[PDB]
Amino acid sequence: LFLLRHSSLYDSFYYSNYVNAKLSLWNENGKKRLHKMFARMGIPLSTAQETWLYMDHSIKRELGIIFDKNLDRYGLQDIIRDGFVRTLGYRGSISASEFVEALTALLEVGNSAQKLTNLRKRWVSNFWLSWDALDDRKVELLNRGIQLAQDLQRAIFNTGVAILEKKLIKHLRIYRLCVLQDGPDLDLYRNPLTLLRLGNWLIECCAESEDKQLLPMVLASIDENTDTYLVAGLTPRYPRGLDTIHTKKPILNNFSMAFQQITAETDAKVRIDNFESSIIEIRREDLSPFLEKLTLSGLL
Amino acid sequence: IDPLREELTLESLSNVKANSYSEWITQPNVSRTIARELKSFLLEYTDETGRSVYGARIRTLGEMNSESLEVNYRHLAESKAILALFLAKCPEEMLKIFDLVAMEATELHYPDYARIHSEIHVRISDFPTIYSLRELRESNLSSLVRVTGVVTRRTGVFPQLKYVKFNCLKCGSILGPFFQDSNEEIRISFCTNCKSKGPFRVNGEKTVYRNYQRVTLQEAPGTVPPGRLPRHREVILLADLVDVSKPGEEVEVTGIYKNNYDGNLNAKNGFPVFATIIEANSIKRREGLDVFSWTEEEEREFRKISRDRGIIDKIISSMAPSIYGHRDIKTAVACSLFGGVPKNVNGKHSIRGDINVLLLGDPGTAKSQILKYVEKTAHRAVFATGQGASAVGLTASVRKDPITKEWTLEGGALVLADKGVCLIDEFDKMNDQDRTSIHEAMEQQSISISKAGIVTTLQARCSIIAAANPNGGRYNSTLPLAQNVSLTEPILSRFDILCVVRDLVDEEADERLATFVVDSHVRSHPENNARQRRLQRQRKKEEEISPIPQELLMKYIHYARTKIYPKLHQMDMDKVSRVYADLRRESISTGSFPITVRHLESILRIAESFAKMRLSEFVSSYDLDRAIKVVVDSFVDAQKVSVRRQLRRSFAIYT
Numbered sequence A: 001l002f003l004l005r006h007s008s009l010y011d012s013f014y015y016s017n018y019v020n021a022k023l024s025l026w027n028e029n030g031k032k033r034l035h036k037m038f039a040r041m042g043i044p045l046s047t048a049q050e051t052w053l054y055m056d057h058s059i060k061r062e063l064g065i066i067f068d069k070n071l072d073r074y075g076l077q078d079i080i081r082d083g084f085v086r087t088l089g090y091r092g093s094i095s096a097s098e099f100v101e102a103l104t105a106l107l108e109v110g111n112s113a114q115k116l117t118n119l120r121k122r123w124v125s126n127f128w129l130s131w132d133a134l135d136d137r138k139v140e141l142l143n144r145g146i147q148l149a150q151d152l153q154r155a156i157f158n159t160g161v162a163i164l165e166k167k168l169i170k171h172l173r174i175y176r177l178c179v180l181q182d183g184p185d186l187d188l189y190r191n192p193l194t195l196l197r198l199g200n201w202l203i204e205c206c207a208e209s210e211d212k213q214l215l216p217m218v219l220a221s222i223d224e225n226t227d228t229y230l231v232a233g234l235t236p237r238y239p240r241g242l243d244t245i246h247t248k249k250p251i252l253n254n255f256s257m258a259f260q261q262i263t264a265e266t267d268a269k270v271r272i273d274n275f276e277s278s279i280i281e282i283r284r285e286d287l288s289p290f291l292e293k294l295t296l297s298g299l300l
Numbered sequence B: 001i002d003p004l005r006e007e008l009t010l011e012s013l014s015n016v017k018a019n020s021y022s023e024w025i026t027q028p029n030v031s032r033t034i035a036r037e038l039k040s041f042l043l044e045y046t047d048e049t050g051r052s053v054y055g056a057r058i059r060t061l062g063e064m065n066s067e068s069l070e071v072n073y074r075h076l077a078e079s080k081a082i083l084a085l086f087l088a089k090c091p092e093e094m095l096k097i098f099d100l101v102a103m104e105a106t107e108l109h110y111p112d113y114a115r116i117h118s119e120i121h122v123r124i125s126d127f128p129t130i131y132s133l134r135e136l137r138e139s140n141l142s143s144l145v146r147v148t149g150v151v152t153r154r155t156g157v158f159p160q161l162k163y164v165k166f167n168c169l170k171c172g173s174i175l176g177p178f179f180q181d182s183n184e185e186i187r188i189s190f191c192t193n194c195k196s197k198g199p200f201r202v203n204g205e206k207t208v209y210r211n212y213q214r215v216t217l218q219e220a221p222g223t224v225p226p227g228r229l230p231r232h233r234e235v236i237l238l239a240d241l242v243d244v245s246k247p248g249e250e251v252e253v254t255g256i257y258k259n260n261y262d263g264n265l266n267a268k269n270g271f272p273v274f275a276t277i278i279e280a281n282s283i284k285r286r287e288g289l290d291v292f293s294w295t296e297e298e299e300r301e302f303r304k305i306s307r308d309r310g311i312i313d314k315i316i317s318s319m320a321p322s323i324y325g326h327r328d329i330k331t332a333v334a335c336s337l338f339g340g341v342p343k344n345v346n347g348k349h350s351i352r353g354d355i356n357v358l359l360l361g362d363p364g365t366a367k368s369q370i371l372k373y374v375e376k377t378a379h380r381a382v383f384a385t386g387q388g389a390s391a392v393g394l395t396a397s398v399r400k401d402p403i404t405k406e407w408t409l410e411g412g413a414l415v416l417a418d419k420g421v422c423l424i425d426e427f428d429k430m431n432d433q434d435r436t437s438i439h440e441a442m443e444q445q446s447i448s449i450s451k452a453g454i455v456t457t458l459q460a461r462c463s464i465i466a467a468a469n470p471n472g473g474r475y476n477s478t479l480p481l482a483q484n485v486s487l488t489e490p491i492l493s494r495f496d497i498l499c500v501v502r503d504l505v506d507e508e509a510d511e512r513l514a515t516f517v518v519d520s521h522v523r524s525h526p527e528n529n530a531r532q533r534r535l536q537r538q539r540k541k542e543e544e545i546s547p548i549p550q551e552l553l554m555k556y557i558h559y560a561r562t563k564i565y566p567k568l569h570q571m572d573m574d575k576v577s578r579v580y581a582d583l584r585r586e587s588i589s590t591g592s593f594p595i596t597v598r599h600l601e602s603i604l605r606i607a608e609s610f611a612k613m614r615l616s617e618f619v620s621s622y623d624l625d626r627a628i629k630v631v632v633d634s635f636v637d638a639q640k641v642s643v644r645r646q647l648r649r650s651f652a653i654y655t
Ligand SMILES: Nc1ncnc2c1ncn2[C@@H]1O[C@H](COP(=O)(O)OP(=O)(O)OP(=O)(O)O)[C@@H](O)[C@H]1O
Pocket: B322, B323, B324, B325, B326, B361, B362, B363, B364, B365, B366, B367, B368, B369, B370, B426, B468, B469, B513, B517
């Protein structure tokens, strides 16, 4: 769940990759199913939306039993897991996943060639902003990171809802394409980490579950301020929490070699400089030709 | 075996052995039999498709954390007639048993639902027998009755004790729990612990409360026989029913008609008369539930229709088809009905989205009828006549709350029509003060009130459509609009589209008008399943005069005003800038009101409304040019003939 100990239970079940993938909350029927689940579990709706700290302590104590009793029915039996929790005296607890999410949020949204340099240097500064937060004397940075993580998750959820509702994910025998060209949150999708967050969100929902074949997904986002696409080549994933022989074998990501070959053949000023080869930057006028070349490559 | 645990059969319930129905129902064995039968009905009732209606109803009830399970009376009557008869004759005890059975059934689906709510009230929806406030007599006391009326009063929401616990003053003993009837207060005249007739008091700070509200239901003016006084009663709304209706609504109330002893009435009238009030059990508004409501299936139809190339023309034509001419009126009024997109800029600049239309012309021109039509078509509309209106009734009125005895404040005509339309007929006849009362709502979009120390500001964001006839009884085409109507320059400026109507004489036009009017009269003669056949013929005629059915259009207006907010992405500003410059260049002539920027704002508003017709969030060029045409024609027609010739000559591309 997403920031269970720093938000409301309803929000924890709402802004979650696995929960949404299992229940497909992006449509109204998913929200109705979630409401029915909460009603069956016995937790009221007003109580479920109260912050974790101020929520009634009885339900907080009995939560594990409630989850065990009433989650098999809705298929969310893989939600339960064992994780590390670190708490300092008289201060609220925090789990490893929440700490990592806060650190990533601080890295992402915390705070011609000139714009590129400014963006990269802002990311470098955010690196140090995150570095300090990793200490026990800088709890304020941790709280700010948690708030920023909440905001980023809300924005990514909204964008994913829009994409899924409008059915922008075209399907091809080899790969799947999702190109963004408008929206209110397109500014955020310039940091590779945020774009990868959106990619993971989309991969979990209907690309790894819902009886769908596993194909690499190419996700791109425009930025009119520089006229280029932050194309990212993501790898598929097997259903979460399903141990099997095929699950043991890692799913290799073949985007790097095909990307390099296509860049070598053509000339579109592709910026292959990120350490992760999955991400490049292609000019606006040369996106569709590059996609056609990738389709013809047959190397994915 | 315990005798108290034995249960009768279904037939034996019909055979009543007791003085009254309540005594029969209250018996243990009969109570258990009734509970079993009600549970069976809830758990085994199926419709034509065979779906268990009440299982899905209970699931939905649990989904929303609601404490009300609506039950259809017809289903109960069809399944178990005797139980329906008992519920009709003795509502209180049957409803208590039904509430217990419904709480068991709900717990069947959601085992832990008791934590969320401990009581699930059962509400009867469709009582076959409908009464009126005039025909209620003593025979209806303590029975379920369905009445129709209009709400004319309402009080605030207060908590009322649900279980009380008294105490003594001589010995200090504390009495047990009781149930507090909504109509009469609990009275104790003798103790049980000290067994003395001494005074008492309310104690036991631990108590469970419930919401309580009271409204005054009055008979519908139309239903009242010719010129008779309307009859009113007081309705009590308990928890889960408060704030379900507001003054000025037509509602149907199903509840228990109870009575109680009132000393004041006996002292006043001089005879042993008892006060009466209705304890509400369900409230509904007064086909189905609401035409404006639409479904997911219908939303797909609207998108298909909007794809039509000339949908805008069909919408304009389908508006007031019974009226032959006055296409400019139809365009303006349709634009007003569709409305605009209000805009705010960083909380520093506010732009109104409403569109105001002033209708002016010769006496017989189909002016009031169009306003009457748009009254029906509009979602929330209020109709007021110039003669029969006042500022106090247009802003608000102050009342005294019978419970708290603190002065409250009513809603006015403009307030009641917020986010809607405020139609005014015979506008020129209104007095100066009332005409000033509307200046604020026209532009400020808010009404300020200061009465009885209740200083506050109210929200009034509504479009105004006004109809009037020119001063002197006719429009002298030679003179300008200034002298023709007595309205002052400000209010005249505030109007966006000014569709002046002119009644001239022409042989061909009069022939066409006569033919259309006579055909309309003959078509609507009263003489010219059975209900389905009637609907089919009505649809035949409706399509005869309307390319689009009225029913679809009514929902179309609501859907467009709700879900679509068109915005101007990019468009050649220079076109409208050039039109504005030319308007100012040609408006310098004496006798023509200067073309202020208010016309430019109106152009944009009409463009947004026109784009709303297609359900397109991109304001294309065609809509902007059409809005330019509308505004230019509206301005040109208002001027004198001498200036009209030059204005028509100069403006050719736009018109
Ligand atoms: N173009 C038209 N087509 C059909 N009927 C028309 C037309 N013009 C006028 N009428 C008829 O003229 C009659 C005039 O009454 P209506 O209520 O429409 O307004 P009015 O009383 O003439 O208006 P005003 O308030 O300006 O005096 C109505 O019966 C209307 O049907």
